[PDB]
Amino acid sequence: VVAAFQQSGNSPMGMVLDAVPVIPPELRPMVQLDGGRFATSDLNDLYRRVINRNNRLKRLIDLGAPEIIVNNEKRMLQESVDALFDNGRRGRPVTGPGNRPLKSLSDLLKGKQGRFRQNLLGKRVDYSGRSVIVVGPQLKLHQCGL
Amino acid sequence: NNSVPGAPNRVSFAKLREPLEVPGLLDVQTDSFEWLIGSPRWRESAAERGDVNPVGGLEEVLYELSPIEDFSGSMSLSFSDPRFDDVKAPVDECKDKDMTYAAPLFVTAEFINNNTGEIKSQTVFMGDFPMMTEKGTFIINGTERVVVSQLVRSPGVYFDETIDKSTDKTLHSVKVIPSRGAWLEFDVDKRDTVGVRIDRKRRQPVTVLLKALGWTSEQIVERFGFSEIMRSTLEKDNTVGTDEALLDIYRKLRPGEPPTKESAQTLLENLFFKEKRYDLARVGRYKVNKKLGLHVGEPITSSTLTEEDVVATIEYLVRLHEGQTTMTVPGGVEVPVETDDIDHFGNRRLRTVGELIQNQIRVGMSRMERVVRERMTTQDVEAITPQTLINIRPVVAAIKEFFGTSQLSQFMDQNNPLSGLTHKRRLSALGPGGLSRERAGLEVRDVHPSHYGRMCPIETPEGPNIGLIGSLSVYARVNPFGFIETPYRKVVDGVVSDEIVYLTADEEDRHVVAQANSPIDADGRFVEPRVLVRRKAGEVEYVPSSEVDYMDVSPRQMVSVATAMIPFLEHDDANRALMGANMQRQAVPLVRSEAPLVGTGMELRAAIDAGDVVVAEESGVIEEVSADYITVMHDNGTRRTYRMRKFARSNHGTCANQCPIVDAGDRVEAGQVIADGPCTDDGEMALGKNLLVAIMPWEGHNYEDAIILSNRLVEEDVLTSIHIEEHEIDARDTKLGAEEITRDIPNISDEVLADLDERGIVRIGAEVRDGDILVGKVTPKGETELTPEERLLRAIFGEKAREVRDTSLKVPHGESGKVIGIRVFSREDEDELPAGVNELVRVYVAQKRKISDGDKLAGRHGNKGVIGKILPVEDMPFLADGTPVDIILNTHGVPRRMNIGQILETHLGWCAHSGWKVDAAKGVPDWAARLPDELLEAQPNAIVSTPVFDGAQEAELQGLLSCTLPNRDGDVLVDADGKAMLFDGRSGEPFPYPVTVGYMYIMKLHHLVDDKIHARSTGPYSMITQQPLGGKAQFGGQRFGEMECWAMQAYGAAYTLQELLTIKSDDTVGRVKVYEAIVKGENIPEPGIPESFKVLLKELQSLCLNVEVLSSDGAAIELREGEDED
Amino acid sequence: VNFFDELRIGLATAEDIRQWSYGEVKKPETINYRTLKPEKDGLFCEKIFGPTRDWECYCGKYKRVRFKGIICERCGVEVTRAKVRRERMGHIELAAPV
Amino acid sequence: EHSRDPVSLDMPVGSEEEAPLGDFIEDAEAMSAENAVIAELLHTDIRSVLATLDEREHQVIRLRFGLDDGQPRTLDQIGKLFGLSRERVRQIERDVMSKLRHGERADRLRSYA
Amino acid sequence: REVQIHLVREVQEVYRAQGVSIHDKHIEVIVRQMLRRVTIIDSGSTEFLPGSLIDRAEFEAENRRVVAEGGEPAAGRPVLMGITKASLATDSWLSAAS
Ligand SMILES: [Zn+2]
C-alpha cells in the first residue's frame, strides 16, 4: 500500500474529504407521475440529510455550543456521509417508509441491479420486433417471410 | 349410476366398480373457511368426526389472547363469542360496483375492573370481514381472488442424523421446531460434546442446560445409567452447579448483562414455559406427543414446551445413538426409535384458507392488544369503557393488506372453468413462511412415495416453479390438524370390505396397502395368492393375500383433476402428460362448444363443481325460459329466477356466457344443470372441438411440430373465439382546475368525433380501431405560461384561450371491435369513487378472433403446435367419400416423444364417430368377453368414456376397429388397422400407401399470435437511462443482451454492433440525426458516445474518483461538448 | 472525435472536486410546493445545475433562443440547452472534514 | 394531497424483472430541435409582420402586450401612455386584427394555429 | 507439453463420450490463455515481489534484458491457472468491475 502511494501520482490526502459532490439532478430525477403523486430517487433523501446536518453544524459552531454538542454533530455528519456513499456498509442501513433500505450512491454500481451488471444485461435497441415463427418450405435458403 | 339426473349417458369401458364417489372437488377451500367463521355446518360435521369440544378459527384467536392484563392485575379485558351478520350486498352487486363482498363482525368484550369490581360488557364492531362466496372465491375490491393453500414444515421434533466422512461416525441431531420461539438443536459431535445451540449460539454441552433445569446429579446418573456415552460426557463436563449453569446460560444467551440468578430464571421461564413468547400450535403438540409418546392419552393442551419433553428428547437422542430400535419413556407408551424425513407427507402439513387468515388476524389482534394495553396503563381508570379501549385500525389494516398484497392471494385465473377449479386446488410451496426458490434445494422438488393419493405427481408447472406447486388428488381430504388424508377400504381377513377409513401418511406406514387393479372375486376373495403391494417406505413386493391390511378405492386415486381427464393416460410418458395437464388449463372458450367424443368420466363432475354452470336448487317445472333468465316453479309454490350473465369479461380477457339448455314446460330435478357456462356442453367440460386428423408428413408445411388446418375451420367458425378488452379513464381534480369529460376537443375534425356521443364517450355498437377516441377528456392548462405571440394570436382572431389540453382515452395500438358496453361511475350520484376523482368511465370493446397462422393448438396428450398453414378445403387430402381431413399432424413427432396415447385416442375416436356393431350372432367374440353387455352396439356420433388407468385395452380397440358400421354409401372407409386410402388434394392421385385417420380432440391454447406481435421504428424513450420504451403507443424495443453481442463479435461485425448499441439505443443526437438522414436521402452519419458511458462517468466521479479519458500524449479529453445544429 | 487510447481512474483531491463543480449547494430544499420550480441555491437550483426548460431563464427576460450563451443578471441561470442539466455538477462544502 | 409522502422510484414495481419504477418513467419532453425551429419561425414572423404594420401600432402591440418588457398594458393604461382614451384601444386592436388577416401577413401566419 | 496433452485429451474425452465433437484448436485456444504465466521464487534484482505470478512476455524478455545490463536473473518456473484467476490477474478494471 505504501509503495502504491509512493508512486505519488495522487497524495494520500484524498482519503479525507472537504467537499462532497452532488450528481446532476437528471440522474436522480424528481418526477410527478400521473395521479398527482410525487416520486423521487433515494439520492435526494440522502443528500438532504448531509446538507441539513452540515448547515446545522455551521450554525452550531458559530453559536459556540459546548464540546459535546459539536462532537455529536460532527459524528452525525460523518455518519450521513457514510450512508450517502454506501448504505448498509456499516451498521443498520437507513430504511425507507416500508423498512426498505435506501439505494445509496454506490448501490448504482454494485449487485445485480448496477451500472456494470446492467451493461452486461444489454441495452434495449430500436428498429426491432418479435413474433411467432412458422416453418415455410417455399422459401430459398436466403429468405425469410415477414 | 349417474349422480346428476340430467347427465348425457356416455357408455364407459370401466371394468372395476368404484365404491366411493368423488368428493366435492372444491371442499378443500370451503371447509377451511367454514371452520374459520365457526359456521353451524362445520360444527355439525365436527360432531361426526369425533371432536367433543370443537372450536372455530376466530373463537380460538381471540379466546387464547384473552384475558389481557395491565401488568398489575387491577384491570383486565376479555372478549369472546364472535358473530357475523348478513352480507352487505350480494356477489353480483359487489362485482359490478367494485365493492368488497364482506360481512361485519361483532364480538362481546367485557371489562372487569378488579379493584372496584363493577363490570361493563357490550358488543364491539370489529370490521367488515371479507366473506367467501359459494364457489370458494374472495371478491376483494371487485376482483375474484383465490388464496392457494400452502405447504409448510410441521412444527415438532425431527431426529435428523448425518454420517461423518473423515471419521465415518454417525452424528445425530434433533432440532425442535416450534411455531414461534427459539431453536434447541441437541447435536452430538465426534468430540462427544453433546451440546445445546439455543438460537444458534455457541455450542454448550447439554449437561449444563440440564443442570440449569435443576436436575440433580444422582437423578441424572440413575436415569441415564444405561447410556455409556451419557456417563462419559457427564464425567467429562467441566462446568457444574445449577446456579453456575443458569448463569452461564444467561451469559451465553444475553452476554454483557448483569449475571443475576433471578434474571436467568426469568429468561428460562420466558423461553420454555411462557405461553406467548414460545408457542407451538395444537398440531405441533400432537406431533411431539406422538413422536415421544408423552401424555398420549391427554388431550391437546398447554402448547408451550414442557421440561418432561426435553428430557424425553435427550433420552431419545442418546438411545438412538446407542442403536436401540425401541424405547419407552416412563409414564408413556413405547415408541419406535428411527430417523425422520421432512419431505415425508407425515411431516409436511397443509394450512388452508382458515389457517392463513387466522394468522393474519392473530397479528392484527397482537398489535391491537398492544395498543389497548398502552391505553389501559395510561388512560383514566374511573370512566374507561371498552369502546374507548378496543381499536379496530390494526385489524382492518392487517386483513386488507393480506388480501391486497400477500403472495397467497392471487388473481383467480378464469381462462376456462378447469383453470379456475385447478387454481383453488393448488398446493403452493413457496411464499412467506415457506422455502424460497433459491433456498429450495433439488431434494424438495422431487417426488416421494408418500404423494400417492395426497398430491398428484404429474401436474405441476413446467417452468422454474417445478415441484414447488402441485394439486390435491381427486379423493384427497384434509384432516383438521392439516395433514392430507386419503381414503382406503380395509380388509378384515383377506376379503375386501365396503366401508372405508381415511388414513394419513403416519398411519399408512404401519399398515400394508394393496392396489386397486388387483383382481378380486365377486365375494371379495383375492383370486391370486400374492398381490402387488406398497410397503413401508416406497417398497413394493408381493405378499401373501392374508397379510394385506388396506386396499385402494379406485385406480384414479393418484391423479389430479386436470390429469384425470386425459384419455389413455396409461400410455403416455410423465413429461407429455405433464404438458397435457398444464395445457388444458390454457384452453380458450370458443363460440360453440362440443363435448369430446372420447373422454374420461371426470368431464361431467369437474364442470358441475367448477361453478360455471347454474344448477337448479330444487325440483320444479320451468314456467318460462329466456336468453337472459330462467324461472323454475318449485313444488312448494315458491318462484325462483336464475339470472345468468351474458358476454361478461373474465379476469384474463376471455368471455363468459351461460345459454340455457332446458325448455319451457320441462320438469327438472334438483341438482340438474340448467345452463352451460363457457367451455361446457350439456353440463360436461368441453374445452375444444373434434377434428378429422390424418397423421402423415405433408409437403413440409407441418415440419417439426407445426400444424396444417383445413379452411373449413376458419369459414365455419369451428375454432372462433371472443375476447373482451376493458379500457378505463378517470377525471380527477387538478391544482389548475377540474378535469371534465366532454365532446369538445381543441382542433379536431368532426369526422374523428363522429362516433362520440353527447356525453363525450363513444356510443354502444360503434366499431373502433387502433387510434380512435373512446372518451373525450379535456384537462385544464389555464395557469400555464402563455407565449406573448400566442396570446396575441388569441386576441387577433378572438380565438378562445382554450388552455385545456386533451388527454383523451384512445384505443391502444392493435385493438378493435365493437363496443359491447360502457359503465360510468360519477361522484355526483355518490358512487363511492376513489378520493380525488369525479368521473370514471370504463369502456368494454369486444373482438371476435378467428384462427390464423401463429395460433397454438394442442391435443390432450401434450402434442403442441403452431398453425403453419391454412390450406383451402380442396387442397386437403380427402377420404374416398369426399370428406376432406380437417387437420394434419406430422408422424415424426409421435414415436420420438413417446405419447402413443394420441394414436389410440384417434382410433377410438373414429370408432366412436362411425358407430360399431359387434358380431353377436355367434356369441361374444373372445376379445369382447370383458366388454359391458351394453357396449356391444353404438350409434354414429356416440360418446364413449375410458377412465384413466382402467379403460379400453389394446385387444378391445383392435376388435372395435374391425366392427365399425359402414358409411351411408355402404362402404367401410378405414380398414382393420385403422388406416385409410387418401386422395391427394393437388395431384389428385391416391397416396401409394394407406394413412391413419380419425377424430382427435383439439383445443385452442391462449398463446395467440395477435398478442405476440411488436414493431418499433421510433417511439417514446426513458427518462433516467434514455432507452426505448412505450406502453402500446410504440411497442418498445427488444433487448440486445450480452449473448447477442458475443455473436456479433464472433462474426467480426464491428460496424453493425456499434449501430445496435450507440446510434439507435442511447446516442441522443445520433438518434435525431439518423432519423433525419433516413427520411431524407443523406447517408446515415457516424455514431457518437453512448449516453450509458457518460452516465457511468458522471456517476463514478460523484464517489470522489477522478476519472479522465486520456488521449495520445497523456492529455485528458474534455468529454463535455456542445454544438448547435442549424 | 473518438480516440480514447487509455482511461485513468485516480483519487479525487478536494481541489479537483471544486474544479468540477459549477457552484455550491447550500440549502436542503428541493422544489417549491406551489410553483413546482427548483428553489434558489437548493438541491435542484437552476443557477448551479442548469435551466429547466430549453432556452428559459427563470425570469422570462431571455425566453427566446435569440439570446443564448448569456448569463442573466436577474437570476444567473445560463440560457442554454436543457439537457445540460444532465452533466453539470455541484459540491457541498463541509464544515468538518470526513 | 399535501400530506402525501412521495413514493420512491427505486421501489421495484410488480416484481417486473426487478425493474425500479423509475425505469418506466417516460421522459416524453425536451425536443430541443423542434422547439428552436418553431420559436425562431413564429417569433421572427410576428416581429416582421408587426414591422410591416404601422410602427406606432407595433409599439402599441409591444406595450399593450409586453413583447419586450411584459406588463400587458390595459386599454386605459396604454391610452394614458399614448395620451389616448380607453375606448380608442378597442378600435386600434380591431384595425390590427383586420390588417393581420389580409395580404402577405396571412400567407406567413396561416400556420402556427 | 504433457499437461497440455492431458487437458485436451480429458476435455475431448468428455465431449466425445457424450456424442458431440469439436475440433481441438477450440480447446487449445483456451489452455493457451490458461497456461501463459510463470511463477517466481526469489527476486534478487527484480522489482516485483517474490511469489508474484508474471507472464512470459513480461518476465522472460525483461529478465533476459536485465541480465544483459548485469542484473542477476530471477528464478521462475511454469505455473498453471484457472479460467477465473487468469482473467482476474490481467483483466482491466473496467472488465473486472462486472
Ligand atoms: Zn433571468
Swiss-Prot record, chain B:
Keywords, alphabetical: Antibiotic resistance, DNA-directed RNA polymerase, Nucleotidyltransferase, Transcription, Transferase
Effect ascribed to mutating S428W: In strain: vr10; rifampicin-resistant
Domain of life the protein comes from: Bacteria
Catalytic activity: RNA(n) + a ribonucleoside 5'-triphosphate = RNA(n+1) + diphosphate
E.C. code: 2.7.7.6
Listed GO CC annotations: cytosol; DNA-directed RNA polymerase complex; peptidoglycan-based cell wall; plasma membrane
Outcome recorded upon mutating K120A: Does not affect association with TRCF, but weakens interaction with CarD
GO molecular function: DNA binding; DNA-directed RNA polymerase activity; ribonucleoside binding
Outcome, altering S428L: In strain: vr11 and RJ37; rifampicin-resistant
Enzymatic class: transferase
Result for mutant: I119A: Weakens interaction with TRCF and CarD
Effect of substituting H423R: In strain: vr7; rifampicin-resistant
Tagged with keyword Chloroplast: no
Result of altering F411V: In strain: RJ37; rifampicin-resistant
Signal peptide start and end residues: none
Impact reported for L408P: In strain: vr2; rifampicin-resistant
GO biological process, alphabetically ordered: DNA-templated transcription; response to antibiotic
CDD domains: RNA_pol_B_RPB2 (cd00653)
Function of the molecule: DNA-dependent RNA polymerase catalyzes the transcription of DNA into RNA using the four ribonucleoside triphosphates as substrates.
Assembly notes: The RNAP catalytic core consists of 2 alpha, 1 beta, 1 beta' and 1 omega subunit. When a sigma factor is associated with the core the holoenzyme is formed, which can initiate transcription. Interacts with CarD, TRCF (Mfd) and RbpA.
Family classification: Belongs to the RNA polymerase beta chain family.
Cited HAMAP family: RNApol_bact_RpoB
The name this protein goes by in its record: DNA-directed RNA polymerase subunit beta
Recorded name of the encoding gene: rpoB
UniProtKB/Swiss-Prot annotation, chain D:
Domain characteristics, as noted in the entry: The sigma-70 factor domain-2 mediates sequence-specific interaction with the -10 element in promoter DNA, and plays an important role in melting the double-stranded DNA and the formation of the transcription bubble. The sigma-70 factor domain-2 mediates interaction with the RNA polymerase subunits RpoB and RpoC. The sigma-70 factor domain-4 contains a helix-turn-helix (H-T-H) motif that mediates interaction with the -35 element in promoter DNA. The domain also mediates interaction with the RNA polymerase subunit RpoA.
Full-sequence range covered: 210 to 322 of 323
Quaternary structure and interacting proteins, as annotated: Monomer. Interacts transiently with the RNA polymerase catalytic core formed by RpoA, RpoB, RpoC and RpoZ (2 alpha, 1 beta, 1 beta' and 1 omega subunit) to form the RNA polymerase holoenzyme that can initiate transcription. Interacts with RbpA, probably 1:1.
DNA-binding region(s), chain positions: 75-94
Family: Belongs to the sigma-70 factor family.
Higher taxonomy: Bacteria, Bacillati, Actinomycetota, Actinomycetes, Mycobacteriales
Protein name listed in UniProt: RNA polymerase sigma factor SigB
UniProt note: phenotype after gene disruption: More sensitive to SDS (cell envelope stress) and hypoxic treatment in vitro. No effect in human THP-1 macrophage-like cells, intravenously inoculated BALB/c mice or aerosol-infected Hartley strain guinea pigs.
Species: Mycobacterium tuberculosis (strain ATCC 25618 / H37Rv)
Function: Sigma factors are initiation factors that promote the attachment of RNA polymerase to specific initiation sites and are then released. A non-essential principal sigma factor that responds to cell envelope stress and hypoxia. Controls a regulon of about 40 genes, with another 100 genes expression being altered during SDS stress and about 50 gene being altered during diamide (oxidative) stress.
Region (Sigma-70 factor domain-4): 49-102
UniProtKB/Swiss-Prot annotation, chain E:
Induction: 6-fold repressed by starvation.
Coiled coil region boundaries: none
Subunit structure: The RNAP catalytic core consists of 2 alpha, 1 beta, 1 beta' and 1 omega subunit. When a sigma factor is associated with the core the holoenzyme is formed, which can initiate transcription.
Function: DNA-dependent RNA polymerase catalyzes the transcription of DNA into RNA using the four ribonucleoside triphosphates as substrates.
Family stated for the protein in its record: Belongs to the RNA polymerase beta' chain family.
Protein name as it appears in the record: DNA-directed RNA polymerase subunit beta'
Gene name in the database record: rpoC
